[PDB]
Design a binder for this molecule. Structure first.
Ligand SMILES: *[B-](O)(O)[C@H](Cn1cc(C(=O)O)nn1)NC(=O)CSc1nnc(N)s1
Length: 262
């Protein structure tokens, strides 16, 4: 597989495993490397969480506009937006934007509670035809990333296929698809990952994840190249030792190879 050789060299130099899937939504061309292997989702589950909340909001009039007046016992580490608005509250739309664009942990757990927990989000992903995705735990326990543990994992391929259905296809009603795309476009946490592989004039929406242990981190994106149909892609990493470091540079490098191979 000569297409795969640069990815094998990249993951060997990194000291672990890289999983990549990219789809050109115009031509149907793909790039695939360990694309059906499981990797931990880490905070990347929060994009799909936001999409699941948008789907619920189609049926529950005014859900996205509802103010949530959470207390301090809803807060957990790395919740910078939830802490800032503790004395104000946040609407469900605001919580969703915080979870997607700042990876806010408390906001994500509040929205999981709205959906019926990790099982609720898994059920939503099954409803759009994703058989691989599983969320089992809440923030912060879902980040353990233990090698060979299937909890809180998906595959690059299933992430890309589900992202395409939600951002570009008909899984959400159009005004909800558009809100999901705008949240991903406004992400603040991904400037050194897929965004670093994209020409500056191309629009991007992405969601990152970082477990940190076991070299585990990831990004997935929709990318709108000038004059072309959009690309959807996912890059996930892991490594065998608890102390192995993740690399944003390796994610960006894998994304560059994926765009080059399409
Ligand atoms: B997430 O489950 O990855 C969550 C918070 N977070 C978001 C991001 C990101 O989007 O890249 N990174 N971390 N992780 C945790 O709360 C605990 S595991 C780590 N947290 N920060 C790290 N850096 S590793």
């Amino acid at each position: 597989n000569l297409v795969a050789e640069p990815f094998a060299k990249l993951e060997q130099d990194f000291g672990g495993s890289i999983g990549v899937y990219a789809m050109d939504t115009g031509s149907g061309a793909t790039v695939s490397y360990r694309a059906e292997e499981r990797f931990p989702l880490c905070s990347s589950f929060k994009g799909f969480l936001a999409a699941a909340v948008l789907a619920r909001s189609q049926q529950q009039a005014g859900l996205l506009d509802t103010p949530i007046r959470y207390g301090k016992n809803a807060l957990v580490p790395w919740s910078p937006i939830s802490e800032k608005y503790l004395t104000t509250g946040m609407t469900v739309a605001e919580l969703s934007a915080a979870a997607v664009q700042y990876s806010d942990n408390a906001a994500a757990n509040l929205l999981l509670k709205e959906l019926g927990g990790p099982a609720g989000l898994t059920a939503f992903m099954r409803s759009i035809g994703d058989t691989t995705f599983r969320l089992d735990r809440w923030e912060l326990e879902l980040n353990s990333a233990i090698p060979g543990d299937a909890r809180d994992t998906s595959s690059p391929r299933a992430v890309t296929e589900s992202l395409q259905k939600l951002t570009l296809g008909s899984a959400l009603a159009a005004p909800q698809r558009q809100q999901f795309v705008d949240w991903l476009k406004g992400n603040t946490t991904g400037n050194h990952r897929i965004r670093a592989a994209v020409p500056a004039d191309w629009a991007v929406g992405d969601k990152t994840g970082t477990c940190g242990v076991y070299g585990t981190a990831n990004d997935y994106a929709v990318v709108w190249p000038t004059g072309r149909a959009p690309i959807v892609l996912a890059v996930y990493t892991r490594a065998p030792n608890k102390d192995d470091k993740h690399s944003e540079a390796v994610i960006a490098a894998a994304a560059r190879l994926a765009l080059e191979g399409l």
